[PDB]
Each structure stands twice: as C-alpha cells, then as structure tokens.
Design a protein around this ligand. Structure first.
Ligand SMILES: *[C@H](C)[C@H]1/C(=C/c2[nH]c(/C=C3N=C(/C=C4\NC(=O)C(CC)=C4C)C(C)=C\3CCC(=O)O)c(CCC(=O)O)c2C)NC(=O)[C@@H]1C
Ligand SMILES: *[C@H](C)[C@H]1/C(=C/c2[nH]c(/C=C3N=C(/C=C4\NC(=O)C(CC)=C4C)C(C)=C\3CCC(=O)O)c(CCC(=O)O)c2C)NC(=O)[C@@H]1C
Ligand SMILES: *[C@H](C)[C@H]1/C(=C/c2[nH]c(/C=C3N=C(/C=C4\NC(=O)C(CC)=C4C)C(C)=C\3CCC(=O)O)c(CCC(=O)O)c2C)NC(=O)[C@@H]1C
Ligand SMILES: *[C@H](C)[C@H]1/C(=C/c2[nH]c(/C=C3N=C(/C=C4\NC(=O)C(CC)=C4C)C(C)=C\3CCC(=O)O)c(CCC(=O)O)c2C)NC(=O)[C@@H]1C
Ligand SMILES: *[C@H](C)[C@H]1/C(=C/c2[nH]c(/C=C3N=C(/C=C4\NC(=O)C(CC)=C4C)C(C)=C\3CCC(=O)O)c(CCC(=O)O)c2C)NC(=O)[C@@H]1C
Ligand SMILES: *[C@H](C)[C@H]1/C(=C/c2[nH]c(/C=C3N=C(/C=C4\NC(=O)C(CC)=C4C)C(C)=C\3CCC(=O)O)c(CCC(=O)O)c2C)NC(=O)[C@@H]1C
Ligand SMILES: *[C@H](C)[C@H]1/C(=C/c2[nH]c(/C=C3N=C(/C=C4\NC(=O)C(CC)=C4C)C(C)=C\3CCC(=O)O)c(CCC(=O)O)c2C)NC(=O)[C@@H]1C
Ligand SMILES: *[C@H](C)[C@H]1/C(=C/c2[nH]c(/C=C3N=C(/C=C4\NC(=O)C(CC)=C4C)C(C)=C\3CCC(=O)O)c(CCC(=O)O)c2C)NC(=O)[C@@H]1C
Ligand SMILES: *[C@H](C)[C@H]1/C(=C/c2[nH]c(/C=C3N=C(/C=C4\NC(=O)C(CC)=C4C)C(C)=C\3CCC(=O)O)c(CCC(=O)O)c2C)NC(=O)[C@@H]1C
Ligand SMILES: *[C@H](C)[C@H]1/C(=C/c2[nH]c(/C=C3N=C(/C=C4\NC(=O)C(CC)=C4C)C(C)=C\3CCC(=O)O)c(CCC(=O)O)c2C)NC(=O)[C@@H]1C
Lengths: 161, 209, 26, 66, 159, 161, 160, 161, 160, 161, 161
C-alpha cells in the first residue's frame, strides 16, 4: 500500500524531481499530525470490542436483519457481520496512521460491493454500521483526532455505496 | 487330500495360525485415513469448515485437528469461502504466515526445516540429499516464503494435489527409501521441540504431590 | 415483536422475585 | 502488493482421471503478482488457455508501493 | 441429514454407496414416522417447554435476572426466552434429519463469537438447554425420549 | 448439497416457523418413496458398466464422433467420454436417493458448459448420451423407480443444454 | 465393519461420534443376530453353492472351459472354483461385519492387476459371482436374500 | 485399526476358515455389549469438558507443575496439556465402541513416549491424569459400562509408562 | 524483545538487518534506562497495586466474590489475586523488553482455553488488569504512564 | 546414477588427468558391447508382462505364499508383489544399457532390506523370483545378450540377500 | 532465539521472581554496549563480500582443497563453501546484535558436524575459515566492536570442532 510520506515520494519520482521545499512542506505537515494519530490509534485498539458492540446496538441488532429472514439471522451470519465490522475498524485505524486512504481501497474496498451483492448483504445497513462506528470512535478519540478519523470512515462508506 | 473336492483342497492353508494377516505389511489403516478434500462453492458451511480444518491440521501439524483461533487466518479463510482463492493459494498463504515461521522455521536448522516443508506440503519425507540441498540453498539465499513458493509451484505438488485437493499424508514408495522415510516422518517424528523460547521447564517436579 | 414472550416474561417476573434466592452450589 | 485475477481452462492430455477435476479445469483465482509469471508458464505448458487476466489490486506504472 | 452425509462421503471417494451406507439409509427411513411424531410432540408443547425451563433457569441462576445481571429487565428477559424458543426449534429439525448438519450451520458454528459480543454468559446457555431437555423428555415415551435426548446433549456439547 | 428432508427444514427456518403438519406430510411422502429409491440405486450400481456400454452403442459409437475427425476419436477422447457418462450416471443416482436436484447443480452442472465450450466437446451429443442412459436405466430399475430416476436425468440434460 | 467406518469418519472430523453415527451403530448391533444366522446358512451350503454356481458360469461362458480359455483343464477348473469359494467366504464375513470393508481389503483391491497377470477374464469372474448370488438367494429366505444380495452385488460392481 | 468383529474375521481369514459357531459366539458376545457401549459413548461426549476439568483438579493443578518452572506452567503449556487430555479421552471413547485397543496403539501411542521425553512432559503425571479421567468417567457411565471403559484407559496408561 | 523480532524477520528474508531495523534498535537501547526505571517503580509498588486493583474489581463485580462465583472462598480469592500478580510481573518484563512477545507467550496464548476449563470469567479478569493499570498510572510519571499504559492495554485487549 | 562412459570420466576427473589411451580403451570396449545391449533392452520391454507372469508361475504362485496366511495372500499383496517384480525388471534393463551396476544400488538396493524386514516380505522368496525372471529373460534375449543381462540380475539378488 | 534481554527475563520467570536491581544491572550493561553493536553490524553488512573474499584468500584458495581431489574442487563445491561462509558471517552478525549465542546454536550449530561428516566436508578447514573471517572483521569493525564480535566467531568455531 501507500502512506503519506511515500505518496509524496511517489509523485516526485515519476517527475524525476529531487525533493523540493513544497514537497518538504507536505512532509512537515504529516509529521506534526503524527503524534495525535498515534494516540488516537491506541485509544481505538483498546476500545475496539466496545466500539463494535455499541455500533451494532445502534443499527444492526433488535432489527429485522437479526430476525428470521434477515441477513444477520443465524449465528453464522451474525458472526460474519461482526467480523466484517472489526475489519472496517482495523483498516480505518491503519489508514489514519498512514494518513492515506489507499490501503482501504487495496484491501477492503476492492470487489466488496460485488461480493456483497452476490451474497445479498444489504449495503445500506453496512454503511449505517460504519457511520455508527465513526460516531462512537469520535467520542473516544476526542475532537482533534475525530476529524482525521472521520475522513477514513467516510471513505469506506462512500466506497460501499 | 483325496475324497476332498479339489477346489476345497487348493484353498486350504497348511500353515494355519502363525500366518500373516490383512494388517501386516502396509496395513489397512493408512489408506482410509486419507480423505481427499475439495472445497465446492455451493458446499454448506459445515462441509467447507471440515476441509479448512484439514488444511490447518496438515500444514501446521494441528494433531487435535481443530485450529486454535489464534492460529487461524481469517481474511484468507473468507477469500477461500468466497471462492476468490484456490486451496492451493490458501496453502501458499499459510506458509508465508508468521505462525508458520515461528513454529517451523525459527526453532529448526535449515536441513530439518526442509524435512518439515516436504512433510507439511507434499505429505512425504525429502526424496534425496539433492532435494534437500536445493531447498536449503533457497532458504539461505531467499526467504522462507520463497521456499514455500517453490514446493507449491513444484510439479510433484501439482500432480498429486493440483489446485483443488487439500494436501494429505501420502507415503509414496515410488523413489527408493521414501516409504520408510515417510513412515518415520509422518508416524514417529512427532514434533519434539517447543516453538517458544521463554519460560523453560525444569526437569524435576515430575510426580504430583 | 416477541409479544407472547413479552407478556409471559412479565407474568414470570410478577409471580416470583429472583432478587433474594442467591446462587446455590448444589 | 499487486494481485491479478485470472481465468484459465486446462485439459488433462497425458492421463484420464476418475475423480472430479472440474475445479482444476476451469479456475478463476487471485494470484500475487510475483507468482503470476510462473503460474502463466505452468498453464501454457499444460496446454491450458488463459481466458482472462485483470489486475485486481495495485496501480499501473507505480514506481513505489509495489 | 443421514442422506446428505452418506452421499457426501461417497462422492468424495468417487464411488457408489456402500452396502453399509445403503443400510443406514434403510434404517433411517423406517424410523421416519417415529421421528416425525417426536418432533410433533415437542412442537406442540413448545411454549410450555421454554417457559418451564426458563423458570428453572432463573431459579438456578438468579443473578442473570437481577439489576446487576445482563438478563435483567423485561425486554432482556423476553430475549432470553426467545433464544430458548429458537434452540428448541433447532432441536426438532435435528431429530427429523437424523443428524446435526441443520442444527450445526444454523446454531453452533460462530455461536461462541456472537454471545461473547452480546456478553450473554454461555456457561449458562448450556444449562438452559439441559433444562429444556428435562422438560421435553417428560413429554415423551422412554424410547422416544432417548432419541430426543441425544440431540439435546449434542447442543450442550457444542457449547 | 441439499436433500428433500433438509429442503423442507430450510424453507421453514427462513420463515422461522416450527415444523407443521403440512410440512410433516411432505416429509412423510419422501419416507414412503425412500425404500424404493434404495433398491433402484443398488440395481444401477451393479449394472453401471453395462448401462454405459448400451447407451454408447445406442448413441455415441458407430457414428461420426468415433470416426476420425470426431470429438470421440482417439483412445484418450473415447475414454474421457465414457468417464463423463459414468459421472452423470453416478450423480443422477445420488440425486435420486437424495430426492433433490441440488447436488447436480452444485457439482455436475456448475461450470460444465464453459468447460465443454473451451474443450470443443459437443453438448448436443452429450445430452443425447444422457437421454440414452435414462432409457436403459428405466428398464433395469423398473417402472415405479423409473419415473423418479427420469426427472434427474432430464434435469442434467436441460442444464447441459 | 460398521464400527470401523464410523470411527474413521469421526477421526477425520476430529470429533466425538455424532448422535446420528451412534444411532447407526445401535441399528447394526440389533441386526447382528439376524446377520449371523444368514452367514451360517451360507456357510453350511457353501460346497453346493460353489459347485452349482460354477456349472451355471460354465454354461453362460463355454469359452472359459475350452482349450483357449483359462479355466481349461482339471487343475485350472479347480482353481476357478477355488476362487469362487474364496469370494463366498468373503461375502459371509461381509454380512456379519455389516460392511464390505472385510471383503474389500482381502479381495477387491488389486484384483484387476492380479487377474490381468493370470490373464483370467474379469467379466467372467463377475458372472460367476452373479451365479453364486442366484444359488445363494434360493437357499436364503426372501428378506435374508435381499441382505445377502447387496454384498454379492458389491463384489460384482467392484470387479467387472 | 481392528475392531472386535474384524478381529474375529481376521483370525479366521489367516486360517482360511469359514466362520464357525465358536467364532459366532464371540461375535454374539460383542453384540450384547454393544448397546451399553453406545450409551456410554454418548455420556462421555456430552460431559467431556467436565471430565477433563475434574481430572485436572484431581491430579494436575494446585501442584508444582502449575507453579513456575513446572511443565504445566505458562498458559500456552496449560492449554497444550488439556488439549492432549481431550485427545486421549476421544480415542478411549473410540476404542470402547470398537471393543479393541488397536486404535490406541496406532494413533495415540505412536512415538508418544519419545516425544514426551524430549519435550520434558512428565510421563508419570500424564499417567496420573489418565487414571483420574478413568475414575471420573466410571462415575458418569455407570458400573456395567465402567468395566469396559476402564480397560481402554488402562491400556493408554500402560503404553505411556 | 525488539531485538529478537528484528533479527527473526531478517533471518526469514535471509538478509542482513535493514537501516530502519538498525535505527529501531538504536532507539530501544537509548530508551532502555528509562524503561528500567519504570519497571522498578511498578515492582516496588506491586503489593499495593494488586491490593487496590483487587478491591476495585470486587466492587465492580460482586458475583466473582460470591457463592456462585469462582473467586468465592479464601483459597479461591487468593488465587484470583495470585493471577493478578502474575499479570503484573508479565507487564514489567514487557516494558523492559520493549515488546509484548514475553507477555504473549507466557500469558496470552491459550489463556481463553485455560480459563474456560477453570470456568473463570475472562471479562472479569480483563477488568482486574484495567484496574491494575489505573493504580499503576498514578504511581508513574505522566510520560512514563503512557508507555506503561500501552502494555497494560495490550493485555486487556488480548484477554477478550 | 552413473554409466560406464561417465565412470571413466569421473575417475580421470578426480585425478585431474586428461583422457588417455588406456582410458580410451575402456570407453572403446563399452561402445562395441552397446549395440547388442540396445537390442536386448527392446526385447525385454516388449515381453515384460509375459516375463513376470512366467517367473511368478515358476516360483511364487501355486505355493504356500498364495495360500491363506501367506505374504502374497490377498489381492492387495499379490498385486504389490508383481509390482515389485516389474520394478526389478525395469531397473535391470536400465543397468544393462548403462553398463554399470551403480544405478541399481542408488535406486533399487538402497533401504530395500530394511523395508522388506519391516513389511515382513520374505527376502529369500523375492530373490527366487528375481532368479526366475533372469532365466526367462535369458531365453528371450538370446545367449550373447544373456551373459550381460545375467550380471545385473545377479547384482540385485546378491544385494537383497 | 533468545536475546540478552530475554535471557535475563527467562531466568527470573522460572524462579517466578520479579525483576530486581542485580538483574537490572545486567540489562543496563547490555544497553551501553548496544550502540557499538549496531555500528559494527552495518560495517559488516556493507563489507560482507569483501570479508569473505579476504578470508578465502587467507585460508581456502590456492590450496589443495581447491585443487582436483579436494572438497572445494568443482564450481559446485566452491560455490557451496562460499555460501556457508556467508551464512556464518550473517549469523555471527545477528548474534552480536542480540548479545546472545543462542541463535547460533538453534540454527547454525545444530546437526552441522554430523552433516559435514556425512558430506566429507573438512571441519578443520571450515574452522580455519571462520577464524580468518574474524580477523578481517576485527579490522573493519574497530577494537571496541571487535571484542564483542570475536566471541561469537569463537563460539561458532568451538561448536564446529
Ligand atoms: C514379490 C516378488 C514378493 C513380495 C512383494 C511385496 N512387496 C510389498 C510391499 C512393498 N514393496 C515395496 C518395495 C519397493 N519399493 C521400492 O521403491 C522398491 C525399489 C524400486 C521396491 C522393490 C514397498 C516400499 C512396499 C510397501 C508400499 C507399497 O505397497 O507400495 C508387499 C505388500 C505389503 C503390503 O502390505 O501391501 C509384497 C507382497 N512379497 C511376496 O510375497 C513376494 C516374495
Ligand atoms: C455486517 C455489518 C453486515 C453483514 C455482513 C456479512 N458479510 C458476510 C460475508 C462475507 N463478508 C465478506 C467480506 C469481507 N471479507 C474480507 O476479507 C473483507 C475485507 C478485509 C471483507 C469486508 C466476505 C468475503 C464474505 C463472504 C464469505 C465469507 O463468509 O467469508 C455475511 C455472511 C453471508 C453468508 O451467509 O455467508 C454477512 C452477514 N451482513 C449484515 O447483515 C450486515 C449489514
Ligand atoms: C438466554 C439464554 C440468555 C440471555 C438472552 C439474551 N439474548 C439476547 C439477544 C440475542 N439473541 C440472539 C441470538 C440469536 N439469533 C439467532 O439468529 C440465533 C440462532 C437461531 C440466536 C441464538 C440475537 C441476534 C440477539 C441480539 C439482539 C437481537 O436479538 O436482535 C439478549 C440481548 C443482548 C444484549 O446484550 O442486550 C439477551 C439478554 N441473557 C442471559 O443472561 C441468558 C443466559
Ligand atoms: C481386432 C484386432 C479386435 C477387435 C476389435 C474391435 N473393435 C471394435 C469396436 C471399436 N474399436 C474402436 C477402436 C478405436 N477407436 C479409436 O479411436 C482407435 C484409436 C485410433 C481405436 C483403436 C472403436 C472406437 C470401436 C467402437 C465402434 C466404433 O468404432 O464406432 C469392435 C466391435 C465390437 C463392439 O462394437 O462391441 C471389435 C470387434 N475385437 C476383437 O475381439 C479383436 C481381437
Ligand atoms: C461423452 C458423452 C462426450 C464427450 C466427453 C468429453 N469430455 C472431455 C473432457 C472433460 N470432460 C469433463 C467433464 C467433467 N469433469 C468433471 O469434473 C465433471 C463433473 C463431475 C464433468 C462432467 C472435464 C472437466 C474434462 C476435461 C479434463 C478431464 O478429462 O476431466 C473430453 C476430452 C476433451 C479433451 O480434448 O480434453 C471428451 C471427449 N465428448 C464427446 O464427444 C461425447 C459426446
Ligand atoms: C474362475 C471364476 C475364473 C478363473 C480363475 C483362476 N484363478 C487362477 C489363479 C489364481 N487365482 C487367484 C486368486 C485369488 N487370490 C486371492 O488372494 C483372492 C482373493 C481372496 C483371489 C480370488 C490366485 C492368487 C491365483 C494364482 C495361483 C495361486 O492361487 O497360487 C487360475 C489359474 C491360473 C492360471 O492363470 O492358469 C484361474 C483359472 N479363471 C477364469 O477364467 C474363470 C472365469
Ligand atoms: C497434560 C496431562 C500433560 C502435558 C501435556 C503437554 N503436551 C505438550 C506438547 C505436545 N503434546 C503432544 C502430543 C501429541 N502430539 C501428537 O501427535 C499426539 C499423538 C498423535 C500427541 C498425544 C505434542 C507432539 C506436543 C508438541 C507440540 C504441540 O504442542 O503440538 C505440552 C507442551 C510442551 C511445550 O513445551 O510446548 C504439554 C504441557 N504436560 C504436562 O505437564 C501434563 C502432565
Ligand atoms: C482473578 C482476576 C480471577 C480468578 C482467578 C482464578 N484463577 C484460578 C486458578 C488458576 N489460575 C491460573 C492461571 C495461570 N497460570 C499461569 O501460568 C498463568 C500465566 C502466567 C496464569 C494466569 C492457574 C494455573 C490456575 C489453576 C490452579 C493453580 O494455580 O494450580 C482460580 C481458582 C479456580 C479453581 O477452581 O482452581 C481463580 C478464582 N477467578 C475469578 O473469577 C477472578 C475474576
Ligand atoms: C582467465 C580466463 C580469467 C581469470 C582467472 C583466474 N582464476 C582465478 C582463481 C581461481 N580459478 C578457479 C577456478 C576453477 N576451479 C574449478 O574447480 C574449476 C572448474 C574445473 C575452475 C574453472 C579457482 C578455484 C580459483 C581460486 C584460486 C585457486 O586456484 O585455488 C584467479 C585468481 C583470483 C584472484 O583474484 O586472486 C584468476 C585471475 N581471471 C581473469 O581476469 C581472466 C578473465
Ligand atoms: C567452506 C568453508 C567449506 C565447505 C563447505 C561446504 N558445505 C557444503 C554443504 C552443506 N553446507 C551446509 C551447511 C549449512 N547450510 C545452512 O543452511 C547452514 C546454516 C545457515 C549451514 C552452515 C549444509 C547443510 C550442506 C548440505 C546441503 C547444501 O549444500 O546446502 C558443501 C558441499 C559438499 C557436497 O558435496 O554436497 C561444501 C563444500 N567445504 C569446504 O571444502 C570448505 C572447508
């Protein structure tokens, strides 16, 4: 995948340009943000199970989906759904550290819509679950971190839909 | 014996007891303990999960036959259950995995590492010292992963299992010495080292008082 | 809706109070 | 890392097999980039035909992150 | 079912069904009418089985239905009963199939994950199934009860 | 795969319904048929090689296919064709016991057309061979069994075409 | 046996024996007494079954008992009958075991290769087994004969 | 492996003898025992987890082995030990159904002693744990079953020692 | 340890240690002195940390220290405290190593399986570790506490 | 493996010597023999199945080995024995072409005794079967060829014993 | 493997002791040495090929071993020997960073003598080559580093002999 630092280097290498002040400024920007991101990532990892539980309570459970005839009916399907939720959370955290959305596209987003459509997983509900996780995460991380965190969650949601 | 119909007399056995039985040479067991597993897309989850568990038990030596969750790899399992990857490609991923490297590469020496490779993928002991030398040179010059990639890419691998069949224990016999060797590696060489270095057990305290 | 469960569950709670029994090793 | 999605059809021209070999014969699959060149060769030597190749993951002409 | 299991083994070995495999199918189909009767009895008495087992469970584990406890509150209590009903329905499916394939896919694989997220205690769900066994077994003839018992025991084992 | 008994169960599970008398009647219907099916299956297994020989004589051999330039020309291709015939027979027998056509879709039918097209195997001739087997099987099994046997053969033929 | 097969399937699944698998074992143990009786009947009538089946086979295929044929000559004819006796013994073992596992290990694995070296025609051998079934069926009760039939049919299927 | 029925058959096959009344009596003996064994096996399977816990409490835990330096010290080793216990229990159950100890010799006992010696697993304690399981099992199964069950447990213990 | 992990990855790749890997080793050796001090603090205050954490845990969960609960009885309660002490010792080893590798092999792999046999509830255990973190953080300096927190958090995450 | 030509080369290579007239004479000797050997090899390959049949009739069959309890009793064991016979014949033919016994040591002879002892295969009988094959081969190949053929068969027999 | 830090930890963990000041002092000792080790490792990696060349020149080449009849005669064997030299160098470097000889025992040293004896590789010459590498390395790394580097080379040499 690609991170913020490598993305800059990537762009300069195709030009063949040595690193320049404008490029350096982008790198400098990342380095200041970095400390915040690391703190946020640790918060998310520690509270990960809770975040998923809260988000499921908000959107997935006590719903028609969990009731028979719904895609989250049966233990097997329920377990698969919470596993996917965990994936989204973990990858968003990776993206937030990286400062790049590429990893989401490369590992999570590519082919997901088509897979979901064949399975019959409802995209709208999934999106709803991602948005719910974002809100929960926002609280835990705190405001400065939340802005950074939000964009990656939003990127996932837009990809799915 | 005269007066006895000849077809009865020809079937008679003079030796009687103290004669060999059906479970004497190769025996009945090792055949029929071998199941070819193929994953089918249509297959029920309960059918699919029996085959996945078999992969884990051949390649990571999970004697109990049901992987502990930390050993599992979930993303690969989901791609396999989705039929985005083949059983062959799943087996390749397992070998490139970190659990493979910690349990099987790091504690052993390279010549033993190769023995374990052939056993784990391929089902047999190494055929020859020339086979051992090629894989040892791969391990030393390139990864563990490059050696894992070589066996799965190997023609032997592709003839016996192809892309659909999960690897099985097969005791060949075609090359010379291989039947013995493959019995010793699949039946007696249980793993005898600890993967982890930390908290070595003290010899005493054998009895429980 | 689990309506049958909803009425049966409250019926059960009203008939007997669990908040005193305490666990028994048995 | 880059990944290819590949469809191929492979015939058994050296021997006739009783067990069901349909999964081996027509196999859409995802292949790491570093493995594909070997896997293409293998299909060609068998006298299989490679029906389709698409790059599932990775960007074309990327100098880094490859 | 019995059928599915037999066929799957044969297909894997790329062979027609053994005499043994055929015999097991014969035995199973003879038992069919009896199995259907056992299932019908349990289906009819479903509400009673769940409820009486529920009561025993709440007596056995007061804590779950206590303000501290997870099951506390009427909505929560209803859900615990709903769960018991689900498990009872599964058992009946098992009996008619003569094997666990249906039960296993619908109710045991991934079960550890789901309840752990919910925080419902599994070292107690098993007890609820045991409870259900006792009630259900009392509505069955001795031979029928034994047959039904196996399926209940499997569930308890699987958790 | 799915069998008749499991098919009823699955239909009730998606509804969430406990098993009811109407459902029980469908299950009961299968149980009466079952004994006959087992007898039929044993007949087919014992006469399998003969069935294939007769069916090939009726349709495939003494034809242009066997003659040079035909798909069944060369020993390798002849052997492959009678191997496929054996597959169809074995799977139809499995389906007849199961009382469900699902297994045919899951194993035999899936990907067959595409494989055949790449190979150059002629579908129409294959279908003809399946139909021939059905007639031969019908005789061996006897009339009551034959009706049940016929539907699975027909299902294969329709799938292939 | 039924037992062996059940254990082997469980080992592969790495599980304790399923309720359904246990039920299959129960059915087998109940059937056992009947099975033993069927086997005893065939054992007593063995000499007759072999002889009668041989005759039918030789009527069905003159060739095997002809100068070209493998069975030709007294010694050879005896050996062909000896083989039929071996298969009958295996069938009895199969009936008591409730599975063909005993039969299969002793008689059906490598059978093609053995007969091909001998140059004996496999389809004729199958006919002899079919013949044996017909004789055996007549001696057995109808219900018993059906049970016995399956095992006979398996042999015919395995070598044809 | 071999079971009771096959063991009789094998003995007669080396003689070349058809089955006789004496042989039939041994087979008859097994068939009466069989029903009891099936019931015992189901009991053990349902209570398997409990059996292992009780047996560990009786012999393995609260000991120097669990305390630091001991083989069963560390969570990884504790988990390994209860894994092995479960294996032994499962195979003993298989042996009891089979009515023969052969299976134990083949899969359970092969190379075990030598492996244990290299690992440093204490054989005496393991034997103690097997004997403990036997006692627990004996209670659950009931007396008639217990005698049959005991011999297989004893067979394992003797092999290990 | 940091060192072990770096070397192991290189060996698998069959390469000498990367510039980045070397840099990470340099950073770790610089941080080492600080790490040793943090570990020493926790070791000294261990008895207090365990006791305070225990109290919080028992307050949060009455059940564990109740007739139904696993912890019930003096012996059992002692064992629950002993467990907490073990986990604290592990954490100290982790801090000096700079990695959870020591912690993970001794305490997190197989933990679920061990506790499930014992029937101890895993979530309660996690709570006890969380409790221990809160006490430990108060003793440590803010910067030190953050470092220590990560290792504590890992444990809590693993025991779930 | 190693052949006559390579054997000379290898001996000179360890000395580091260039090829000399004496060496050339050994090479020349092989080249005259060669044509005869090729003809013999073709004869053996065409009659291979017959050779094995005749040799079995001479030694193995109509014996106690085939009778129940014997190691060649059961179809599985009979088939394995004739498979081994075929291997010995094939490798002897390879050795005769090569003009060197080394290949027999590397591929056939290595580990054979130990394997046979574990299996319980009787070595003496096997040797007898090899000797029988040699006699049959001798007839087919003709006298000149037979002498060359005999040494390789004898080499196998001596190794086994 | 186990590093210096983990070796201390292991000793205390088997005792069950929390880490103490004396233990801390050993850890402190390692941390001062650490910076030197990292510098040495980078030197060795950059000069690795040269180190092997110089060491071979000192001991292996221009010798009887390279000349015909010697173990390093033939390109294949020459290349194998320089490959072994490279492995020794790489593992010694790993050990020097780790501050522990364990890795050498676990991978390099285990079964090496026995392998060499079967191959016919001369141990004495190999040891000589290791000692030669040490001297060359000593120069490159500089004196402080050299002392640390030397012990691991010596450890390899003693193990081999
Ligand atoms: C036949 C003349 C005699 C005989 C043979 C016999 N062999 C086996 C079993 C095995 N045979 C081999 C031997 C080889 N493998 C090799 O690679 C080579 C060198 C090229 C040989 C010669 C092996 C390894 C086996 C075991 C595995 C297998 O079956 O493939 C048996 C059967 C044992 C069994 O239980 O099947 C027999 C009968 N025994 C006789 O009675 C003849 C005297
Ligand atoms: C949960 C919010 C929703 C939901 C999820 C759900 N997913 C599946 C099945 C699959 N999920 C995936 C997706 C992924 N696999 C991956 O590796 C990744 C990227 C890291 C993702 C996101 C896949 C591939 C599958 C299919 C195969 C598999 O099981 O692995 C299901 C199960 C469907 C089934 O019956 O198998 C479900 C339920 N569906 C909901 O109800 C929620 C809205
Ligand atoms: C009763 C034994 C325990 C208990 C009950 C309880 N259950 C839930 C919630 C759920 N139950 C399910 C489970 C299933 N869905 C399925 O598809 C199947 C298989 C057929 C089962 C078993 C589901 C999905 C839920 C989650 C919410 C929902 O039903 O939509 C709850 C609520 C969970 C919560 O944390 O609020 C409760 C309380 N609680 C106990 O303590 C008993 C031991
Ligand atoms: C003559 C030496 C022996 C003999 C021959 C025989 N063959 C058939 C029928 C067929 N033979 C073939 C064979 C081939 N098809 C090919 O592609 C090739 C390879 C190039 C061959 C050798 C085929 C396909 C048939 C089927 C009929 C057809 O060709 O359409 C018979 C007829 C018997 C029957 O139909 O049942 C016979 C008699 N039979 C002997 O006994 C001789 C020893
Ligand atoms: C016979 C009626 C006709 C015929 C058949 C034919 N098939 C092939 C090759 C293949 N056949 C299959 C089909 C299957 N494999 C499976 O797994 C299944 C489902 C269980 C089926 C039905 C496959 C996969 C192959 C390819 C490899 C193989 O041998 O299995 C050929 C050979 C074509 C070639 O050149 O390879 C032929 C001749 N063709 C006819 O003309 C008959 C009408
Ligand atoms: C009779 C139906 C057919 C027939 C038979 C026939 N067989 C032989 C020779 C042998 N037959 C066997 C067979 C067995 N050994 C086993 O282990 C089993 C299973 C238990 C069997 C069935 C063996 C071993 C032999 C070899 C000789 C020996 O027993 O030592 C012959 C004579 C040999 C020959 O080729 O001349 C014959 C005639 N022949 C037919 O064509 C009949 C249809
Ligand atoms: C429990 C009562 C005692 C105990 C057990 C224990 N075992 C291991 C490690 C191993 N256990 C085995 C055993 C088997 N492997 C097999 O293949 C079979 C037979 C088919 C058995 C029964 C094996 C091979 C291992 C090694 C690798 C593995 O774990 O898979 C340990 C751990 C040893 C270690 O250092 O990791 C333990 C603790 N030990 C006790 O102290 C109890 C008395
Ligand atoms: C306290 C937070 C919770 C609790 C603890 C508890 N533990 C036991 C018994 C044991 N715990 C262990 C655990 C370990 N052994 C190890 O090697 C490690 C890692 C270093 C750990 C943590 C062991 C081995 C035992 C078994 C007894 C023994 O020590 O030999 C109990 C007692 C249960 C019993 O019946 O023995 C308890 C109560 N229980 C709770 O509910 C608290 C939340
Ligand atoms: C001449 C074309 C080029 C050249 C030669 C050169 N070689 C060496 C040193 C050695 N050469 C060998 C080679 C072999 N050993 C074998 O076993 C074989 C195959 C039979 C060969 C070809 C060896 C082993 C050595 C090492 C020294 C020794 O003999 O023990 C040198 C000296 C190397 C040095 O740098 O000191 C040279 C110069 N070099 C050229 O420039 C020519 C293009
Ligand atoms: C060079 C100083 C001396 C020499 C070396 C030599 N070694 C071999 C063969 C082997 N060497 C090893 C050793 C290792 N392999 C490893 O992976 C490691 C640990 C990382 C070591 C140290 C092994 C296992 C082999 C056997 C297989 C292989 O080649 O990889 C040879 C080849 C001998 C042969 O005939 O095969 C040689 C020449 N020998 C000398 O002459 C020098 C004194």
């Amino acid at each position: 995948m690609q991170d913020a630092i490598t993305a800059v280097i990537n762009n300069y290498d195709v030009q063949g340009k040595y690193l320049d002040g404008a490029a350096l400024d982008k790198l400098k920007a990342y380095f200041t943000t970095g400390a915040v991101r690391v703190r946020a990532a640790a918060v998310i990892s520690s509270n990960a199970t809770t975040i998923i539980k809260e988000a499921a309570a908000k959107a997935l459970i006590y719903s028609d989906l969990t009731r028979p005839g719904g895609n989250m009916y049966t233990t097997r399907r329920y377990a698969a759904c919470i596993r996917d939720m965990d994936y989204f959370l973990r990858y968003a955290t990776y993206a937030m550290l990286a400062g790049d959305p590429s990893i989401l596209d490369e590992r999570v987003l590519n082919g997901l819509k088509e897979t979901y459509n064949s399975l019959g997983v409802p995209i709208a509900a999934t999106v709803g679950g991602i948005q719910a996780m974002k809100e929960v995460v926002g609280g835990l991380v705190g405001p400065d971190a939340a802005k950074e965190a939000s964009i990656y969650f939003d990127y996932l949601s837009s990809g799915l839909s | 014996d005269m007066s006895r119909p000849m077809f009865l007399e020809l079937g008679r056995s003079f030796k009687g007891a103290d004669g060999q039985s059906v479970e004497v040479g190769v025996g009945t067991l090792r055949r029929q303990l071998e199941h070819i597993y193929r994953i089918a897309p249509d297959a029920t989850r309960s059918e699919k999960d029996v085959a996945i568990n078999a992969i884990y038990r051949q390649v990571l030596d999970v004697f109990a036959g049901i992987p502990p969750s930390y050993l599992r790899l979930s993303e690969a399992e989901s791609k396999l259950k989705n039929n985005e990857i083949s059983v062959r490609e799943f087996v390749r991923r397992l070998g490139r995995s970190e659990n493979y490297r910690k349990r099987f590469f790091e504690p052993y020496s390279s010549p033993k590492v190769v023995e374990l490779l052939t056993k784990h993928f391929l089902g047999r002991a190494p055929i020859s010292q020339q086979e051992i030398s090629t894989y040892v040179q791969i391990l030393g010059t390139k990864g563990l992963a490059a050696a894992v990639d070589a066996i799965v890419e190997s023609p032997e691998y592709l003839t016996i299992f192809n892309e659909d069949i999960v690897p099985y224990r097969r005791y060949p016999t075609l090359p010379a010495g291989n039947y013995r060797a493959s019995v010793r590696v699949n039946d007696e060489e249980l793993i005898s080292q600890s993967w982890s270095s930390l908290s070595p057990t003290y010899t005493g305290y054998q009895y429980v008082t | 809706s689990l309506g049958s469960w909803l009425d049966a569950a409250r019926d059960l709670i009203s008939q007997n109070d669990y908040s005193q029994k305490a666990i028994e090793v048995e | 890392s880059r990944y290819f999605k590949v469809t191929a059809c492979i015939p058994s021209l050296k021997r006739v097999r009783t067990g069901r070999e349909l999964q081996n014969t027509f196999f859409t699959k995802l292949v790491p980039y570093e493995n594909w060149f070997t896997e293409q060769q293998r299909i060609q030597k068998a006298g299989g035909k490679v029906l389709s190749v698409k790059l599932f993951t990775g960007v074309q002409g990327a100098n880094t992150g490859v | 079912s019995v059928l599915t299991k037999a066929i799957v083994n044969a297909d894997a070995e790329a062979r027609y069904l053994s005499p043994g495999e055929l015999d097991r199918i014969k035995s199973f189909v003879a038992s069919g009418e009896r199995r259907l009767r056992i299932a019908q009895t349990l289906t009819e008495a479903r509400e009673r089985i769940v409820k009486q087992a529920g009561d025993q469970l709440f007596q056995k584990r007061p804590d779950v239905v206590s303000p501290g406890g997870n099951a506390y509150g009427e909505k929560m209590t209803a859900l615990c009963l709903r769960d018991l009903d689900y498990y009872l329905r599964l058992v009946t499916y098992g009996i008619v199939a003569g094997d666990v394939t249906p039960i296993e896919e619908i109710g045991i694989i991934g079960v550890k994950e789901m309840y752990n997220s919910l925080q419902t205690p599994i070292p107690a769900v098993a007890e609820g199934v045991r409870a259900m066994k006792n009630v259900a077994t009392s509505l069955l003839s001795g031979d029928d009860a034994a047959e039904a018992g196996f399926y209940f025991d499997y569930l308890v084992g699987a958790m």
